[PDB]
Design a protein around this ligand. Structure first.
Ligand SMILES: Cc1ncc(COP(=O)(O)O)c(CN)c1O
Ligand SMILES: Cc1ncc(COP(=O)(O)O)c(CN)c1O
Lengths: 419, 409
């Protein structure tokens, strides 16, 4: 009861946080001694594995003072900046202490540099009150943000009068939006003459050694975080000197803290090769071939969206979704409940074999659900909203859009989110 | 050229950042190999010393996974929250990733909980644009903040309409404001029925094992940061459940990152004894006895405000200020230029002897300024503004305040 916040974390059947006492690679141990295989991985910020030895040794050494001081500049600051700039492009780069801080700073900078008041947004951008929803949909909230819920129909309407729009700010999802969705967003922004900000806090550096939307969107400004430091407390923005000039006003006390620079430098050295990203895609795709087969062989109506990099279970009903995570928890498979699963590079052959055996047993426990009505679009929309906070791509008419927004938002009114 | 930000850090004569390759206790080594005694200490966030061995082992252990995972809860979370609650009081505690994030979340929470639009501010609260200057003084900025510059006269004017005030939010300075200033602030807040938020990011946990203003202000909500983790990336807010209920909407990805929790737990354990704060006060005070005598024997018009916990040089002119830091730089004494000096618990007898010897040499280098015109009030206001972003305490009538604000802005 001391904690004033409500952090997203694995929680047990009583909604209490699970207490983990140790972690190594893919494996967590809880306070009771039970071993879990981690598909959550701090919401996909642990690309390399828990307690990765090279990152951990870099951090341990930096904690001694041997790599510099929080007092000021070290050559590792250059190393991190240079690596980011090489991977993600743009002219300048800034460093921040959370994704939330970075996206807020990025969009305010664009608002300042363009002199325009409105932000058109799709997806989650962090906990800051600036993103809190408006009273009426398609109306600006109190901080000048209009949420379009990934609907490019709605976006086209908003961009008819584009002169007040400072930027379109989008958190990509590559499970629920196709490449062509991104092409259309880009050309809607081009036609309107508006700035495009890619919030790649989650997806940046994970699909490839750069932005996931580098070619698809060629954003004017980008943000990354989860992929840059194997979980350590850093994020980054980059893009044009002109658009980001207002960032010259940013400074914070811990900027030079050397453990965080150490972890970023070490993780980004791995990220730059593209190897962990490939390892993760391959491991997760292996797990998926198996899980899809096991669900099909057991007649369970659960689809899987996405791929090895990030995948999501899409069960036909909420009661089956509940029973799925209950069963997984019983078997020590730690999924990020309802959201996307993001394996790490520590998912080696032995880990995969065990996760496959555990998943087979999950499917055995789910026997009562065999033969149920298959997955319908209503379920696909509800489950996708739980990862992207807006609408998956599918054909619909404007009235279907309105109805889905109304239903999806109403049903989340009195539930905690899991950002 | 790549860096979009302009970070505060030690910079050379061309304003280029100084590059430090190693650090241990009180000592830094720069890229040229020159060894410096650090009075800056990450702007006063290094209470214990660089590479403190106990913190270092706690961090190393946590880096391996042996204390848990960034995936979720660990008993170290409970440890940190319990220690903060014991030290600072209140009902609830939240953790954040910078002082800036913590103060913003705290004040927005209070605005939501009270349903009142205005924040009356004195001092620096972080880099966020919510704190940017209004287009005209005593007027709200675009985010509903009215800066009163630590003038209690101006605060009184602003509190005549207290229905619109969510909170008064103050960053203490104990060099330039007396205990009486705090008592009067407390009195005025209570009379108006307005919430008082102590932004103790800098001063929290450093003067004592608790809030610097626990007794003077008894704030409804507090924020600390620089004192809690020997420089690691964490800050904390606490106070009443009611006022901070809106923090229930806060979550962030790296919340459970184990190295930061480890550093906080270890630093807070030491903070709780009161030993490092005493060691810092004593070491600083000794250094100050020496520095004051040296400046006086050299006939140098430089006063020193504050005490061993945080002190500031107040030179008579900007020319002499610049010459003072130039000379300190040549002798390997790294001061936080123009701001407050914050020694660490690593300032032992050997560091102190060497610092004393170096500062004596500084005073020799400054012999050209001997006998210069003494420090005046305009200098005192200017230098104090550099540390507190408002007005040092001194008797003023409204027109003197108005004119100082115009001159200093
Ligand atoms: C797309 C996006 N943007 C911003 C954020 C916020 O990042 P943080 O949790 O580090 O504040 C997140 C993390 N939920 C994210 O997924
Ligand atoms: C009183 C006060 N409040 C807030 C902040 C911002 O803290 P941070 O630099 O960690 O963002 C500072 C930084 N010195 C401060 O001194």
């Amino acid at each position: 009861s001391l904690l004033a916040e409500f952090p997203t974390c694995p929680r047990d059947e009583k909604d209490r946080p699970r207490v983990f006492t140790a972690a190594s690679g893919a494996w967590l141990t809880d306070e009771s001694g039970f071993r879990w295989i981690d598909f959550d991985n701090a919401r996909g910020s642990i690309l390399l594995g828990h307690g990765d030895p090279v990152v951990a040794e870099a951090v341990a050494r930096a904690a001694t003072g041997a790599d510099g001081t929080a007092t000021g500049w070290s050559r590792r600051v250059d190393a991190v900046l240079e690596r980011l700039h090489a991977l993600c492009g743009g002219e300048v780069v800034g460093l921040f202490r959370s994704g939330t801080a970075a996206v807020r700073a990025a969009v305010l900078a664009v608002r300042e540099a363009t002199g325009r008041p409105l932000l058109l947004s799709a997806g989650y951008h962090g906990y800051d009150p600036m993103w809190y929803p408006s009273e009426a949909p398609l109306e600006p909230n109190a901080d000048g943000v209009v949420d379009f819920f990934f609907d490019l129909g709605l976006l086209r309407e908003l961009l008819r009068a584009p002169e007040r729009v400072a930027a379109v700010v989008v958190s990509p999802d590559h499970m629920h939006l196709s490449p062509g969705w991104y092409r259309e967003l880009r050309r809607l922004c081009s036609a309107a003459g508006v700035v495009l900000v890619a919030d790649e806090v989650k997806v940046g550096l994970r699909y490839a050694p750069g932005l996931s939307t580098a070619e698809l969107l060629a954003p004017d400004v980008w943000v990354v975080a989860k992929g840059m430091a194997n979980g350590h407390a850093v994020s980054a923005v980059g893009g044009s000197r002109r658009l980001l000039k207002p960032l010259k006003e940013v400074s914070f006390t811990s900027f030079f803290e050397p453990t965080i620079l150490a972890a970023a430098d070490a993780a980004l050295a791995r990220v730059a090769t593209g190897e962990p990203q490939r390892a993760v895609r391959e491991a997760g795709d292996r797990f998926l071939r198996h899980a899809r087969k096991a669900l099909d062989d057991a007649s369970l109506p659960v689809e899987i969206a996405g791929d090895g990099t990030f995948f999501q279970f899409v069960p036909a009903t909420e009661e089956l979704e509940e029973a799925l995570y209950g069963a997984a928890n019983a078997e020590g498979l730690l999924f990020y409940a309802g959201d996307n699963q993001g394996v790490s590079a520590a998912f080696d052959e032995a880990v995969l074999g065990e996760a496959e055996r555990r998943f087979a047993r999950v499917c055995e426990r789910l026997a009562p659900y065999a033969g149920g009505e298959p997955v319908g679009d209503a379920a696909r929309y509800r489950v996708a909203w739980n990862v992207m906070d807006g609408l998956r791509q599918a054909p619909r008419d404007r009235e279907e859009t309105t109805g889905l927004l109304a239903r999806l938002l109403d049903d989340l009114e009195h539930h905690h989110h899991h950002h």
